[PDB]
Amino acid sequence: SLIPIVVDIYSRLLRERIVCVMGPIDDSVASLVIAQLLFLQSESNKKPIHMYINSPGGVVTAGLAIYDTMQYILNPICTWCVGQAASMGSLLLAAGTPGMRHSLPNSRIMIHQPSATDIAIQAEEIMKLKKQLYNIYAKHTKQSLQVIESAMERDRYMSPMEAQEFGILDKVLVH
Amino acid sequence: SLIPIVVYDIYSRLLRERIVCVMGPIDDSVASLVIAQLLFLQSESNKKPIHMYINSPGGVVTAGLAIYDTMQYILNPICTWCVGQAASMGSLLLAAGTPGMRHSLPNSRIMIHQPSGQATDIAIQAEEIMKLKKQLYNIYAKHTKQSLQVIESAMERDRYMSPMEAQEFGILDKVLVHPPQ
Amino acid sequence: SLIPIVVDIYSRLLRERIVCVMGPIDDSVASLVIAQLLFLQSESNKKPIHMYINSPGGVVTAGLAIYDTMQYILNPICTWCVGQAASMGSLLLAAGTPGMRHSLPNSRIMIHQPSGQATDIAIQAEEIMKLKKQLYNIYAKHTKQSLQVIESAMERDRYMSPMEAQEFGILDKVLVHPP
Amino acid sequence: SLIPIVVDIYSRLLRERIVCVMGPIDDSVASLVIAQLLFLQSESNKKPIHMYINSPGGVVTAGLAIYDTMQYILNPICTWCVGQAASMGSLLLAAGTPGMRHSLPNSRIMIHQPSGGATDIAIQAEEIMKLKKQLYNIYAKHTKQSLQVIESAMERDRYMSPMEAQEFGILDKVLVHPPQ
Amino acid sequence: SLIPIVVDIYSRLLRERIVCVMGPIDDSVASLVIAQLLFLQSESNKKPIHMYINSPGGVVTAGLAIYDTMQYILNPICTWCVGQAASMGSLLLAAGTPGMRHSLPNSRIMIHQPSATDIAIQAEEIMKLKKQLYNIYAKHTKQSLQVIESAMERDRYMSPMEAQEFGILDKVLVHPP
Amino acid sequence: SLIPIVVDIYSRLLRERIVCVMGPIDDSVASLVIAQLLFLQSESNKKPIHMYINSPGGVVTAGLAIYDTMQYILNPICTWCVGQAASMGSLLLAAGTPGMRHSLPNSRIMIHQPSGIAIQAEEIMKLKKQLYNIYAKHTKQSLQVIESAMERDRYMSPMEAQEFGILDKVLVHP
Amino acid sequence: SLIPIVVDIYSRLLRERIVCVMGPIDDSVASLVIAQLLFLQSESNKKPIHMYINSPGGVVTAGLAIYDTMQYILNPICTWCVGQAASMGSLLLAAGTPGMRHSLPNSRIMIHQPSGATDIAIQAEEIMKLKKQLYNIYAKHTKQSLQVIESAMERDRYMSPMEAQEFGILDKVLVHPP
Numbered sequence A: 001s002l003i004p005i006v007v008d009i010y011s012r013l014l015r016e017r018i019v020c021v022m023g024p025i026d027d028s029v030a031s032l033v034i035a036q037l038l039f040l041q042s043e044s045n046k047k048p049i050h051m052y053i054n055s056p057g058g059v060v061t062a063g064l065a066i067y068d069t070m071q072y073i074l075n076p077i078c079t080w081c082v083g084q085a086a087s088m089g090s091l092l093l094a095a096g097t098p099g100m101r102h103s104l105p106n107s108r109i110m111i112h113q114p115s116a117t118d119i120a121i122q123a124e125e126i127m128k129l130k131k132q133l134y135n136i137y138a139k140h141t142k143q144s145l146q147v148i149e150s151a152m153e154r155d156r157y158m159s160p161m162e163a164q165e166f167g168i169l170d171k172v173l174v175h
Numbered sequence B: 001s002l003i004p005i006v007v008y009d010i011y012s013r014l015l016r017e018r019i020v021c022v023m024g025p026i027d028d029s030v031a032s033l034v035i036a037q038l039l040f041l042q043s044e045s046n047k048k049p050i051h052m053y054i055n056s057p058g059g060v061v062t063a064g065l066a067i068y069d070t071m072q073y074i075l076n077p078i079c080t081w082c083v084g085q086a087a088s089m090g091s092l093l094l095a096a097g098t099p100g101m102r103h104s105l106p107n108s109r110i111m112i113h114q115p116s117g118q119a120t121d122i123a124i125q126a127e128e129i130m131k132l133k134k135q136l137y138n139i140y141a142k143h144t145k146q147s148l149q150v151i152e153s154a155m156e157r158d159r160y161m162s163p164m165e166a167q168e169f170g171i172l173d174k175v176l177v178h179p180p181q
Numbered sequence C: 001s002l003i004p005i006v007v008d009i010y011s012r013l014l015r016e017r018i019v020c021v022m023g024p025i026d027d028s029v030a031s032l033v034i035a036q037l038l039f040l041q042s043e044s045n046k047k048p049i050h051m052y053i054n055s056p057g058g059v060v061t062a063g064l065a066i067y068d069t070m071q072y073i074l075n076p077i078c079t080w081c082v083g084q085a086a087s088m089g090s091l092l093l094a095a096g097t098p099g100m101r102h103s104l105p106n107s108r109i110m111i112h113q114p115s116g117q118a119t120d121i122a123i124q125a126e127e128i129m130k131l132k133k134q135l136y137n138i139y140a141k142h143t144k145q146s147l148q149v150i151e152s153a154m155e156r157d158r159y160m161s162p163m164e165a166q167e168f169g170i171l172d173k174v175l176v177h178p179p
Numbered sequence D: 001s002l003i004p005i006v007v008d009i010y011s012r013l014l015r016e017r018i019v020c021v022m023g024p025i026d027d028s029v030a031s032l033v034i035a036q037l038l039f040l041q042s043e044s045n046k047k048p049i050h051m052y053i054n055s056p057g058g059v060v061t062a063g064l065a066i067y068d069t070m071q072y073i074l075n076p077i078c079t080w081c082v083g084q085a086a087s088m089g090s091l092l093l094a095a096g097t098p099g100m101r102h103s104l105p106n107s108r109i110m111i112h113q114p115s116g117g118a119t120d121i122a123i124q125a126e127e128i129m130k131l132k133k134q135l136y137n138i139y140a141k142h143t144k145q146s147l148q149v150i151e152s153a154m155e156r157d158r159y160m161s162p163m164e165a166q167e168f169g170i171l172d173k174v175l176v177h178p179p180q
Numbered sequence E: 001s002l003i004p005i006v007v008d009i010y011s012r013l014l015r016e017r018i019v020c021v022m023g024p025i026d027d028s029v030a031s032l033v034i035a036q037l038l039f040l041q042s043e044s045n046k047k048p049i050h051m052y053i054n055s056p057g058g059v060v061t062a063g064l065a066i067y068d069t070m071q072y073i074l075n076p077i078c079t080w081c082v083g084q085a086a087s088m089g090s091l092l093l094a095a096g097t098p099g100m101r102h103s104l105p106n107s108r109i110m111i112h113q114p115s116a117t118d119i120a121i122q123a124e125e126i127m128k129l130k131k132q133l134y135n136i137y138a139k140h141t142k143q144s145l146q147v148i149e150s151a152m153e154r155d156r157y158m159s160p161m162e163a164q165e166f167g168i169l170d171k172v173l174v175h176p177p
Numbered sequence F: 001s002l003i004p005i006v007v008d009i010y011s012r013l014l015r016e017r018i019v020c021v022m023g024p025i026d027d028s029v030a031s032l033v034i035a036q037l038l039f040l041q042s043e044s045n046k047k048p049i050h051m052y053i054n055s056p057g058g059v060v061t062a063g064l065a066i067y068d069t070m071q072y073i074l075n076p077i078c079t080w081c082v083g084q085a086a087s088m089g090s091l092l093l094a095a096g097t098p099g100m101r102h103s104l105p106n107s108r109i110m111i112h113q114p115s116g117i118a119i120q121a122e123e124i125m126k127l128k129k130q131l132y133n134i135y136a137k138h139t140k141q142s143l144q145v146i147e148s149a150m151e152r153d154r155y156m157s158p159m160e161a162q163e164f165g166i167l168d169k170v171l172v173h174p
Numbered sequence G: 001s002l003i004p005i006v007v008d009i010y011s012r013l014l015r016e017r018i019v020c021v022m023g024p025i026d027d028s029v030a031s032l033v034i035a036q037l038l039f040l041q042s043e044s045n046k047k048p049i050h051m052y053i054n055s056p057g058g059v060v061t062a063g064l065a066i067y068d069t070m071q072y073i074l075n076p077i078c079t080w081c082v083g084q085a086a087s088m089g090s091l092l093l094a095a096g097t098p099g100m101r102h103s104l105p106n107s108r109i110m111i112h113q114p115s116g117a118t119d120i121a122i123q124a125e126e127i128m129k130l131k132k133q134l135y136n137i138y139a140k141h142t143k144q145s146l147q148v149i150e151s152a153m154e155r156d157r158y159m160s161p162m163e164a165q166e167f168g169i170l171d172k173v174l175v176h177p178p
């Protein structure tokens, strides 16, 4: 028992121009997501693309690959948080086109990074990655580096409204 | 190991009947699957009822809340049906059905008590577990019409309800033995 | 090596309106049996449905889900025991339509419940007992035996012959060839 | 191993009305064999069915499920022992239509049952004896040997040659080349 | 794993009437080989059947199953040893139709049996199987039982020419005629 | 779930003349990449081929197999670093056609090799020297610069990769 | 990996008469390679076959199985070393048709055998018999003396393509399409 067929449902979502990041982020997810984003831009570089995010996070470099692809394509991107968006998941959520970042009412949003890496790396390198995340979160939340760094220190989740206040998303909708 | 074929694919057939199955433990991939089916069925007709079959011991809370938010999101009425059991997040989805359209078979077991803990994708702090718990208190109260204190006390009891008890408590609306007609 | 093709045999059985409970019972089996039963009722709610049972038991709640579905649908249900029907398997066997519960001559039938899968999640003493009582009532309903008779019999760790099962009220007919 | 294609080689064998019981016998093998036997009966309830046996034995109840099915259907059944027919395997071999039970020349036949298990769930001492006595009666029925003879023979932990199995009543003919 | 398509390589060999015993021998291999042999006979009980052998051996009863099917069918059977034919593998190689048992130049051939298979069996039984192997080898090589028993006692491989002298095969070929 | 269908998604990329080196490099990855490179050349020995690299590295000989095929085929090869190009990954990135080596803004490049198929000390060193020569050929740095730089256990940004000669362009938008 | 489709990549290579030996060699690989070689011979007895070799070695008897098939078929065989050709891999590389044995510039070639390979454990005399067969094969195709082969295979080392050329393992090292 695996995937149903419709009048494949995940292919159906791709016809809707929906890209799913609904799990832990690794290099395989990144490749699949990136391949889909470039394909949808080709079908149309003006029509919006929709990203469904239900991820606890994952590999940083895998997440930044998706982010860079989101920034590369010309399409407006509507991000949708369902379930949760934690760590790199919340970075992709905040990277949506301004005005088009949404969450469902009961989602949980976390920008705190966990205590991840394809290979072992040095202290100076984890900190360079961390600082890249600070700049991206700052860019898209309109918050200063300081309040980003301090907020990412708190090991906690935000509600959709808190995330809206903080600048991670724009709209919280029930229907 | 083989999923039989009909006059094609039994589970594709249920989906043509607008039937979605939550028939096991709930995790992120189940939620991904259910959610996609609900949004698909809505697009075929946003007024025609959808039916959700629930035989689940529970699972990941955020995955269950993902399904719950999608249930409340779509315009369709939703009939929930409990066969076997609806425990933990399973009973939440059962109680989240359209009022008057929440059913159980006669011998099912319903539990709103949450398990002591794999209801998390990643380990979390004490304060977050409590925020999630209160989210559940509010949802059970919203759909059962019981007060917070009644829900909080009831969820502290490690027990299952019978369908008739679940009906009196406001979790479901009718217990069926045979089809009306 | 795995499942030939008729000119799929299990899909052929489903054309015959045959449903298979041929292994241990869990939520996955229950979901598949239930989907088939409802599908067959829609093709026709009067044509008999046939359930083949060769099972050592399984999850109680999953077995009750099948049982409830059997009782829900309009179709008459012929139950056939090949090999054995143990624990929840004998409950489904006994739940067939009166006069339509069968067994092959050398099958083994046990209504004794094993000690201690059994449940999907761990449960309290009171819950295990409430499940046991649901079995008592079902067995009493379809065998026409009193509760005390059921409770005492289910306390014996033994198997029955098809004949003993007929005398006890679990099945109606024991057959060697097409009756 | 990956089956080739001519259409699948095993679906081709089913068109020839050949059912294979190769390897150990469990509930899944039984459900499959039974389904094939009932299917072949429907295609023609008089045409012989052929059963190839290369098995070391297996679950008793599963073996009896196949056996009862063999006795249920109308069709004649030819049994062919290739390699070995041990324990429940030799019971299916011996349950073929009288006169249509065969073996290749170098096969090994054993009616002795294996110690311990053969069982889907653990069982009491009285039940295992009940099942054992069922096997005595089946072997007695088709070999035309007495219960005492069967009980004593199954106590010996040994195999038979095809000709010993013929003289004992398990099979009817040992073939080296295609009969004409 | 990644089996290429030819406008299925292993089904192409079956069209050529080639059966493969290309690994260790167990009941599943025997079911397949036997099914293919009977299929090929039915398409023609006169045309030769070819058996490619690169096997280290395996289950005795499984190997005897194939052997019996080889002797059963009417077709002449050409056996071909590529790589190695050890234990039951060498028996199948030797069971080929007289004059049609071949090997490539660098193959290794062993009639020595390895020191469980099938199920746990008694001492008398394993000896009965061993005696069945002696007789088979003695039939197809034309050696006496004494010669067979002593040769199977040596833990060693033969070259194709040694196996030719011994009677296990008839032709050692480098290239086609 | 597995891969989606469009009209498979990676077969679509191949129709675009895109080859993916999107994970750790091993022999199986090498044989697949190689076959796609030779196939694309047959389709056309003149149309650019694009290589997407998100790799932490892998087997050296496997990576050199890919590198040699890149240098063999006549096509211009455009390399694109997304996420990271580390160890052999950064070598294939630098092996692109001059002027056609790219990276997205937040990628990480590392030419340091990892400390680690059961070979002798002389052979590990022979292999390392081959990497030096290759990096020196395509970055236009001298060997001493390559050897000292590969000693540092660090990652480069795309911009320092550019000034070092690993890539040519850092793109943000089309 | 997930094999892509073109309008299967490895079946496209086989239509080019390319057979791949791109990993460790075992009876499974040999069975497949042999089947491909005999199929391509029937497509044309004389058209060259191409063999891509990126292998660390494998079972000796499996390797000799492929080698015997290579010498059996009438087709000329072009060998192409990419990545590496170690132990039995280098034997297959060296077994190509004289003048048609190739390597890319950065490949590594090793004729030294490993110490551990064995379908079934064997005696000491047998493993030396096999070793002698490898000696004779390498001698035949490199045109070196047995003594030269025996000494070289002691040295636990890899050769460069140009060093394999002057030893007689291959004939051409090329960078771009000739």
Ligand SMILES: Cc1ccccc1Cn1c(=O)c2c(n3ccnc13)CCN(Cc1ccccc1)C2
Pocket: A034, A035, A038, A039, A042, A068, A069, A072, F012, F013, F016, F017, F018, F050, F052, F080, F082
């Ligand atoms: C039409 C189509 C369909 C599927 C995928 C791609 C395309 C078109 N298409 C591209 O989108 C790009 C390139 N390219 C080459 C030939 N066709 C295409 C070259 C690289 N470029 C930059 C890039 C790389 C990775 C991530 C983000 C951005 C994008």
Ligand SMILES: Cc1ccccc1Cn1c(=O)c2c(n3ccnc13)CCN(Cc1ccccc1)C2
Pocket: A012, A013, A016, A017, A018, A050, A052, A080, A082, A104, B035, B036, B039, B040, B043, B069, B070, B073
């Ligand atoms: C027609 C169809 C078929 C299958 C799937 C989707 C659709 C249509 N369709 C949507 O239903 C939604 C969006 N969208 C964008 C393009 N097409 C669609 C965007 C937002 N999304 C909100 C959402 C997400 C998860 C759970 C609940 C609600 C709904």
Ligand SMILES: Cc1ccccc1Cn1c(=O)c2c(n3ccnc13)CCN(Cc1ccccc1)C2
Pocket: B013, B014, B017, B018, B019, B051, B053, B081, B083, C034, C035, C038, C039, C042, C068, C069, C072
């Ligand atoms: C036509 C068809 C085909 C396949 C499967 C079902 C159907 C028809 N069909 C039903 O049988 C039922 C419902 N339903 C909704 C749309 N179609 C159907 C909803 C309620 N359900 C009650 C039930 C649930 C579980 C177990 C037992 C009984 C029965």
Ligand SMILES: Cc1ccccc1Cn1c(=O)c2c(n3ccnc13)CCN(Cc1ccccc1)C2
Pocket: C012, C013, C016, C017, C018, C050, C052, C080, C082, C104, D034, D035, D038, D039, D042, D068, D069, D072
């Ligand atoms: C025509 C056909 C094709 C495939 C499978 C079955 C059939 C016909 N067919 C039966 O053979 C039987 C029943 N049945 C009901 C509708 N069709 C059929 C019901 C009872 N069953 C008894 C039995 C069961 C298992 C083992 C041995 C004997 C036989």
Ligand SMILES: Cc1ccccc1Cn1c(=O)c2c(n3ccnc13)CCN(Cc1ccccc1)C2
Pocket: D012, D013, D016, D017, D018, D050, D052, D080, D082, D104, E034, E035, E038, E039, E042, E068, E069, E072
């Ligand atoms: C036409 C065909 C196609 C595939 C497979 C077989 C056949 C023909 N065919 C047989 O060859 C045999 C039987 N049989 C029955 C219907 N068709 C066939 C029954 C007896 N069996 C004897 C045997 C068994 C095992 C090994 C050796 C010999 C041979």
Ligand SMILES: Cc1ccccc1Cn1c(=O)c2c(n3ccnc13)CCN(Cc1ccccc1)C2
Pocket: F034, F035, F038, F039, F042, F068, F069, F072, G012, G013, G016, G017, G018, G050, G052, G080, G082
């Ligand atoms: C047309 C096509 C399609 C797929 C693959 C190849 C081809 C054409 N094609 C070649 O490209 C090459 C050879 N060859 C033989 C028949 N067809 C082809 C032989 C030698 N090989 C050299 C090589 C090998 C590995 C890596 C790099 C270079 C190139």
Ligand SMILES: Cc1ccccc1Cn1c(=O)c2c(n3ccnc13)CCN(Cc1ccccc1)C2
Pocket: E012, E013, E016, E017, E018, E050, E052, E080, E082, G034, G035, G038, G039, G042, G068, G069, G072
């Ligand atoms: C046309 C074709 C296609 C695929 C496979 C084979 C053939 C043709 N074909 C043979 O090549 C051979 C035989 N044979 C019989 C019927 N067809 C064929 C018999 C002997 N075999 C010897 C051999 C075995 C292994 C390796 C090398 C040589 C060669």
